[PDB]
Each structure stands twice: as structure tokens, then as C-alpha cells.
PDB file of C-alpha atoms and ligand atoms in Angstrom:
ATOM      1  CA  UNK A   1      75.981 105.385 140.446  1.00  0.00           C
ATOM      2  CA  UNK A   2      79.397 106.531 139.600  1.00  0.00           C
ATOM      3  CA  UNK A   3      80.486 109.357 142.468  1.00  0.00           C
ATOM      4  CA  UNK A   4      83.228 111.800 142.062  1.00  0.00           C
ATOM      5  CA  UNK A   5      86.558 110.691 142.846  1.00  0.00           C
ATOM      6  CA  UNK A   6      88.520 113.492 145.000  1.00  0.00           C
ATOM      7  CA  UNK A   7      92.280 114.437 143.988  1.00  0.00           C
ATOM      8  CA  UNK A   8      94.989 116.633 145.878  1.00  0.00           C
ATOM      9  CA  UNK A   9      95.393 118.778 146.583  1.00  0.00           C
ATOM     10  CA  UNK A  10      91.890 118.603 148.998  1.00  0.00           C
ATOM     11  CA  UNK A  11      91.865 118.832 152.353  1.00  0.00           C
ATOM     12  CA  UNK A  12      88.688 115.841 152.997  1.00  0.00           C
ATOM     13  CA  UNK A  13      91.329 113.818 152.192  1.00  0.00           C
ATOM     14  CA  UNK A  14      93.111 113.677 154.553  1.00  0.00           C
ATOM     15  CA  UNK A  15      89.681 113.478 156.749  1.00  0.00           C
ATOM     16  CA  UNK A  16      90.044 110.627 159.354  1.00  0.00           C
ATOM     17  CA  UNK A  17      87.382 108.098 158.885  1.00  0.00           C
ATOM     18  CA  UNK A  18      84.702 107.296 161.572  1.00  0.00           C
ATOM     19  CA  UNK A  19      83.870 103.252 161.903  1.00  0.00           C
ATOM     20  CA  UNK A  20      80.641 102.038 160.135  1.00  0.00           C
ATOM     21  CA  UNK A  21      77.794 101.701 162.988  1.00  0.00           C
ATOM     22  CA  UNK A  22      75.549  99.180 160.851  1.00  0.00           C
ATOM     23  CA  UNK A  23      75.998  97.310 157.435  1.00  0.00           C
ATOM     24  CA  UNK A  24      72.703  98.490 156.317  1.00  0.00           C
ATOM     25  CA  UNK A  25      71.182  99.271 153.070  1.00  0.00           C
ATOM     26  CA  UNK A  26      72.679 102.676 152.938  1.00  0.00           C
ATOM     27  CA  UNK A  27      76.230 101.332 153.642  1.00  0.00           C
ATOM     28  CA  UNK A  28      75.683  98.500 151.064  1.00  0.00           C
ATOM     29  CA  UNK A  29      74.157 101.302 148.372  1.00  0.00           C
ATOM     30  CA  UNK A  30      77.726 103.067 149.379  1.00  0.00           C
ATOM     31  CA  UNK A  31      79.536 100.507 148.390  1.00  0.00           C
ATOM     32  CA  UNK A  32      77.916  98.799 145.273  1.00  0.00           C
ATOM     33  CA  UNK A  33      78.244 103.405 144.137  1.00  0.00           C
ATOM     34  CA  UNK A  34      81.988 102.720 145.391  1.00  0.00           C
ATOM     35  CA  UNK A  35      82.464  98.950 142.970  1.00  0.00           C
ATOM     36  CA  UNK A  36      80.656 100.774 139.990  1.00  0.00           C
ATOM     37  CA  UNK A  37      83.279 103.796 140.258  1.00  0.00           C
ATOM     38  CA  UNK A  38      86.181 101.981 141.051  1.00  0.00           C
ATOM     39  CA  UNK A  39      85.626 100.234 137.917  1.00  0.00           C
ATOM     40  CA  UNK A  40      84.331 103.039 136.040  1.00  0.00           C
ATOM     41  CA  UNK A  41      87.937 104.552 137.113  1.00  0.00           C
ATOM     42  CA  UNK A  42      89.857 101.285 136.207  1.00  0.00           C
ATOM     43  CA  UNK A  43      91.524 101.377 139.741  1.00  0.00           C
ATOM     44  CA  UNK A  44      91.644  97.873 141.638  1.00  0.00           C
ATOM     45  CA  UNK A  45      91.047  99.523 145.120  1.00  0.00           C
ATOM     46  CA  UNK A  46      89.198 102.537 146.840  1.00  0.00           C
ATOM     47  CA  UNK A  47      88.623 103.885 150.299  1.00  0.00           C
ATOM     48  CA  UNK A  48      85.128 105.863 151.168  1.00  0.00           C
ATOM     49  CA  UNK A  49      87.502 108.899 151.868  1.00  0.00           C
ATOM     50  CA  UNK A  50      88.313 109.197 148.311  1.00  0.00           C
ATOM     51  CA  UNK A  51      84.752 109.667 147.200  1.00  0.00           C
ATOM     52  CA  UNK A  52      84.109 112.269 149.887  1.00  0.00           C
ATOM     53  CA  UNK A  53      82.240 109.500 152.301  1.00  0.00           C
ATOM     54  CA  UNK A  54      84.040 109.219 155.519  1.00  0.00           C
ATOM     55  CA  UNK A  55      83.480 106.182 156.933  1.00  0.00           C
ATOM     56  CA  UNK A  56      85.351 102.880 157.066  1.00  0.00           C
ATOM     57  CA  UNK A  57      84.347 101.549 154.035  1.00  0.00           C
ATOM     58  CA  UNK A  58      87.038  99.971 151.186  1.00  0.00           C
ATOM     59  CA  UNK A  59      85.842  97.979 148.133  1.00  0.00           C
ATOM     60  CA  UNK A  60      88.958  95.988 146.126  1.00  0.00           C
ATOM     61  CA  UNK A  61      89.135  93.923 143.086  1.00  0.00           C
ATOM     62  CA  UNK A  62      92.939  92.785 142.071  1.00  0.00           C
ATOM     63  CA  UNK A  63      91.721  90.037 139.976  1.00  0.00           C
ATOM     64  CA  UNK A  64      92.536  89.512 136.665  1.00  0.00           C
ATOM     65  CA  UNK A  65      88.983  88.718 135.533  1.00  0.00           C
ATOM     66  CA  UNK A  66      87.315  91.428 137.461  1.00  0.00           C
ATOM     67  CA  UNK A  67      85.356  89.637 139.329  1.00  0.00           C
ATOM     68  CA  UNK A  68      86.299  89.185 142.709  1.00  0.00           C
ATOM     69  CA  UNK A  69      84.718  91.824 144.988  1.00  0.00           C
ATOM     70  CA  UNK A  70      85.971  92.138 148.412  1.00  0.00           C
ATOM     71  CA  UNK A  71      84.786  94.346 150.442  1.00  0.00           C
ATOM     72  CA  UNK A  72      86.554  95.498 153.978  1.00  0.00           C
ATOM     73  CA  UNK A  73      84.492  97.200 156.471  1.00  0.00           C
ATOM     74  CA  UNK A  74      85.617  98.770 159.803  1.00  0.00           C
ATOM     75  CA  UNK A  75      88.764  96.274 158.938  1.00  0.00           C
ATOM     76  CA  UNK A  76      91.592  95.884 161.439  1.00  0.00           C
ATOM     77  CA  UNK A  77      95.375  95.148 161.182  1.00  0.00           C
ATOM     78  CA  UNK A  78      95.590  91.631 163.073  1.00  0.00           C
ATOM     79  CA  UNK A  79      99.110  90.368 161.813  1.00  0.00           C
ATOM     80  CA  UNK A  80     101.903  91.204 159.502  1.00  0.00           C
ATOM     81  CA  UNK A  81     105.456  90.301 157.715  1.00  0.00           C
ATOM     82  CA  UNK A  82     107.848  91.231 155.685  1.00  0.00           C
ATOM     83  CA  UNK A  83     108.569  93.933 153.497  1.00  0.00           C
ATOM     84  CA  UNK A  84     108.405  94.754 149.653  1.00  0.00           C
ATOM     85  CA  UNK A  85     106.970  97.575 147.722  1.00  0.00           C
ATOM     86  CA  UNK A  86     105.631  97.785 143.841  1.00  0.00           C
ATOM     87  CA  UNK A  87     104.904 101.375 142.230  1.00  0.00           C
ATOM     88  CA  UNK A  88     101.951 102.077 143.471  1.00  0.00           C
ATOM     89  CA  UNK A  89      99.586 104.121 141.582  1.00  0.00           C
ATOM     90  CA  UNK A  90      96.048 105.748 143.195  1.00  0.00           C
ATOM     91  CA  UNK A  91      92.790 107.463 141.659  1.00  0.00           C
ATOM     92  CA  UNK A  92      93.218 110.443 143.587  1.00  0.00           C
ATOM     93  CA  UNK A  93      96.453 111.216 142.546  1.00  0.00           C
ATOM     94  CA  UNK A  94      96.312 110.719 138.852  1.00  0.00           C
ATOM     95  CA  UNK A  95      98.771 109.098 136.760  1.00  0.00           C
ATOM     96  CA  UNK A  96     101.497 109.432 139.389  1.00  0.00           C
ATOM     97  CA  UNK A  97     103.280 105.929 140.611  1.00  0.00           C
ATOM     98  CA  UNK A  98     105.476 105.558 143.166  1.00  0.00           C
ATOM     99  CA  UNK A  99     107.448 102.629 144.992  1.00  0.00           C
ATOM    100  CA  UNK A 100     106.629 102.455 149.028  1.00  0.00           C
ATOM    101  CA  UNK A 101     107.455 100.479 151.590  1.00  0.00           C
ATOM    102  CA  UNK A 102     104.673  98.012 152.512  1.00  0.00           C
ATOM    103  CA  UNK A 103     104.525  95.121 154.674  1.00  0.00           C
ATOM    104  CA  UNK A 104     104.803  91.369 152.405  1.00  0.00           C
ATOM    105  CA  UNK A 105     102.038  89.716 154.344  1.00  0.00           C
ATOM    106  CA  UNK A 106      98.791  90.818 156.421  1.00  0.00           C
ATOM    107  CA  UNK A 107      95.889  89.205 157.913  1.00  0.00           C
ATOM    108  CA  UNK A 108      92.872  91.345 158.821  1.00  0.00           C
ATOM    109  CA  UNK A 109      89.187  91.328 159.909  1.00  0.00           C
ATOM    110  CA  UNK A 110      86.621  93.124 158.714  1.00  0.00           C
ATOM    111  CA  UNK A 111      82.843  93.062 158.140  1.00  0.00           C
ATOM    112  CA  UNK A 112      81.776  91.947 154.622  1.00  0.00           C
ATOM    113  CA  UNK A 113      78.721  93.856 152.650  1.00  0.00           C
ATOM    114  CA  UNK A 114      75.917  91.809 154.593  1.00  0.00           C
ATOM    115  CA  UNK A 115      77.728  93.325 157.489  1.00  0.00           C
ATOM    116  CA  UNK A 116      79.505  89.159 158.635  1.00  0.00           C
ATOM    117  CA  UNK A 117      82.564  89.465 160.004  1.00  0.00           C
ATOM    118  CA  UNK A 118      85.195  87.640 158.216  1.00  0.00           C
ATOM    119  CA  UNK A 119      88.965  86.710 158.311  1.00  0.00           C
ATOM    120  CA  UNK A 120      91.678  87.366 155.302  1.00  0.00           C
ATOM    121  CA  UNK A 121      94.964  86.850 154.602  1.00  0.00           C
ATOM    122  CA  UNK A 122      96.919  88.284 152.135  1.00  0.00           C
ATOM    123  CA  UNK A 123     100.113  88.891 150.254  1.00  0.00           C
ATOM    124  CA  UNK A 124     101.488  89.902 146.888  1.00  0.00           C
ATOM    125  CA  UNK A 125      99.546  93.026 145.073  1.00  0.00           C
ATOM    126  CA  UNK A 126      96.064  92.207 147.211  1.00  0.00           C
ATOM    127  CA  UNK A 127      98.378  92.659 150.615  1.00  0.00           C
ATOM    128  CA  UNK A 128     100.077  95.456 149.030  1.00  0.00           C
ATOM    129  CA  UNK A 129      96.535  96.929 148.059  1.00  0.00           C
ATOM    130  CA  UNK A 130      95.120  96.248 151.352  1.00  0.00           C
ATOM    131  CA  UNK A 131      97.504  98.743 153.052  1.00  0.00           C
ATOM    132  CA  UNK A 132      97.342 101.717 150.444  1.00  0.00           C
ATOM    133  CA  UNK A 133      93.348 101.679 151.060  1.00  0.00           C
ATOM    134  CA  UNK A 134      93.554 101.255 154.377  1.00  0.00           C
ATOM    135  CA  UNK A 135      95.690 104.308 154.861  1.00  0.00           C
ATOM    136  CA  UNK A 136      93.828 106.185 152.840  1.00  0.00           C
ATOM    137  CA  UNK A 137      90.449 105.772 156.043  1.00  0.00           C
ATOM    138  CA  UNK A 138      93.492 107.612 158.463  1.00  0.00           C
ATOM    139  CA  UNK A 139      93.998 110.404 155.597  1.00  0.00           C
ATOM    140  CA  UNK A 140      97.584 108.732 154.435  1.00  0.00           C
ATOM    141  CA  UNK A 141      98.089 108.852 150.624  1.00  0.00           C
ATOM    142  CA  UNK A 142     101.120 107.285 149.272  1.00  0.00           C
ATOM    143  CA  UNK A 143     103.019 110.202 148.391  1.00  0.00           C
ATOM    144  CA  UNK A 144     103.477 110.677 152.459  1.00  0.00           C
ATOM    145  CA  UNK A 145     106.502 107.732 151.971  1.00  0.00           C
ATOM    146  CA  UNK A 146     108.516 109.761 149.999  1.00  0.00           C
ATOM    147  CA  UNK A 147     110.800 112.927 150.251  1.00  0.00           C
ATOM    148  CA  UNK A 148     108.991 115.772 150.969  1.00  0.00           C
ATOM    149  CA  UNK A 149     110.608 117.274 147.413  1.00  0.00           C
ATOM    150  CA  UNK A 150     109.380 114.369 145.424  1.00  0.00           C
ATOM    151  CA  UNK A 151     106.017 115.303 147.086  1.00  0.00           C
ATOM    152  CA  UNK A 152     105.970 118.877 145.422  1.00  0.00           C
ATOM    153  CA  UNK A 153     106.954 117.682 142.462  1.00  0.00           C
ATOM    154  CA  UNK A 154     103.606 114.952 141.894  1.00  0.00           C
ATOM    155  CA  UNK A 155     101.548 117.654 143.722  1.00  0.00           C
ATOM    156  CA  UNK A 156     102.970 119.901 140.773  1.00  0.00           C
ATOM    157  CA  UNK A 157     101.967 117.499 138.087  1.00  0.00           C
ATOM    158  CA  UNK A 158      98.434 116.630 139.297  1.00  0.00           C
ATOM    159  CA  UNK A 159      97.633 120.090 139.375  1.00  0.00           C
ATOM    160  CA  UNK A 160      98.753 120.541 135.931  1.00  0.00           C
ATOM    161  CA  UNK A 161      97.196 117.162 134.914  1.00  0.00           C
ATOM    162  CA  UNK A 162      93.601 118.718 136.380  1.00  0.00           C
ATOM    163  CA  UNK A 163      94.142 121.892 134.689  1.00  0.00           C
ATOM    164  CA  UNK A 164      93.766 120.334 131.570  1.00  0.00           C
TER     165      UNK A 164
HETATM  166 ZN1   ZN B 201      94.630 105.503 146.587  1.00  0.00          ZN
END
């Protein structure tokens, strides 16, 4: 099922995320709904907060042939490096991109959709990725990197874009 994809300006989210108690078949219904809207959205990444579900939950797909699912529950931040930043874009702030500051390099650990934990690390756009989504499960959206006047202005222009 495709679910309904929240956009600022909304309060849930910037909800803070509780941690998944059990990979079960609810949490693996959540995120096979989160794959088929991600995709139905054309995005490469999205958090559980974003479709009004909050819960550590993230689904990603940066490949090329779309169709390499990863899935990151409850993940933690074990290591990173670097710096570099591409502009960004996100579903819940539609057709706004901006360049932010992420780390080059992270490794985390999450639990995978039959609830295993599992080891990854990354760099490039999945790396980059990683970090927007998992800010989004602390209520961070990208726009909160830049000035707070470049903030009004995309706030402006989503609300306009939504209007229509
Ligand atoms: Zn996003």
C-alpha cells in the first residue's frame, strides 16, 4: 500500500522516533507499505516519521537498477569520516534541494526486515543518504543546516507548491 507522505510545514515531523521492540509482521508490513511508496514517490530513501509512523524504521534504495533494498532498523551511528555534501533533495519537502554538510564515510548497525542484526559501511550518495534518513527518526530535516532565512524561503515555496 502506498501511505501518505507528510510535508512541512507539520509538526509529526519533527516527532522523535521510539526504537522498534520486535521485527514482526506488522513492522515488516510497515516497511514493504514504506518500499512501495518510496518508489511510488521516486525518492531513494525514507524514514517511518515521514509517513506519520514513528518508529525507527528507514527503507533505502540508491541503486541504479532499483533493486537493492536495504532496510535499517533501530540503526546506530558506530563510526564516521570525512566530510562532503551533494544537494540533497527529500519527499517531504518537495522539489527543494539543498547542499549540507554530511560526514564522507559511516558504518552502522541495524536490524534487517527479518529483524538480524547486520553491519554496513558506507560512503558516496548511500553514506550521504544514510544520514538524511537517519535524522529525519530525531525530527531533523535538511533545511535545519542552513540559514534560518534560506529556511523561510523553501518553507515559502512548499507551501505554495501544496497550494497548487
Ligand atoms: Zn527526507
Amino acid at each position: 500500500s502506498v501511505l501518505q507522505v507528510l510535508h512541512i510545514p507539520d509538526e509529526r515531523l519533527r516527532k522523535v522516533a521510539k526504537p522498534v521492540e520486535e521485527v514482526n509482521a506488522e513492522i515488516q508490513r510497515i516497511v514493504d507499505d514504506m518500499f512501495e511508496t518510496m518508489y511510488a514517490e521516486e525518492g531513494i530513501g525514507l524514514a517511518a516519521t515521514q509517513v506519520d509512523i514513528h518508529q525507527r524504521i528507514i527503507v533505502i534504495d540508491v541503486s541504479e537498477n532499483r533493486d537493492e533494498r536495504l532496510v535499517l532498523i533501530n540503526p546506530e551511528l558506530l563510526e564516521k569520516s570525512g566530510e562532503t555534501g551533494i544537494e540533497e533533495g527529500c519527499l517531504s519537502i518537495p522539489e527543494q534541494r539543498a547542499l549540507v554538510p554530511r560526514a564522507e564515510k559511516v558504518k552502522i548497525r541495524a536490524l534487517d526486515r527479518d529483524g538480524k542484526p547486520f553491519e554496513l559501511e558506507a560512503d558516496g550518495l548511500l553514506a550521504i543518504c544514510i544520514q538524511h534518513e537517519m535524522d529525519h527518526l530525531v525530527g531533523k530535516l535538511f533545511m535545519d543546516y542552513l540559514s534560518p532565512l534560506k529556511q523561510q524561503r523553501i518553507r515559502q515555496k512548499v507551501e505554495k507548491l501544496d497550494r497548487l
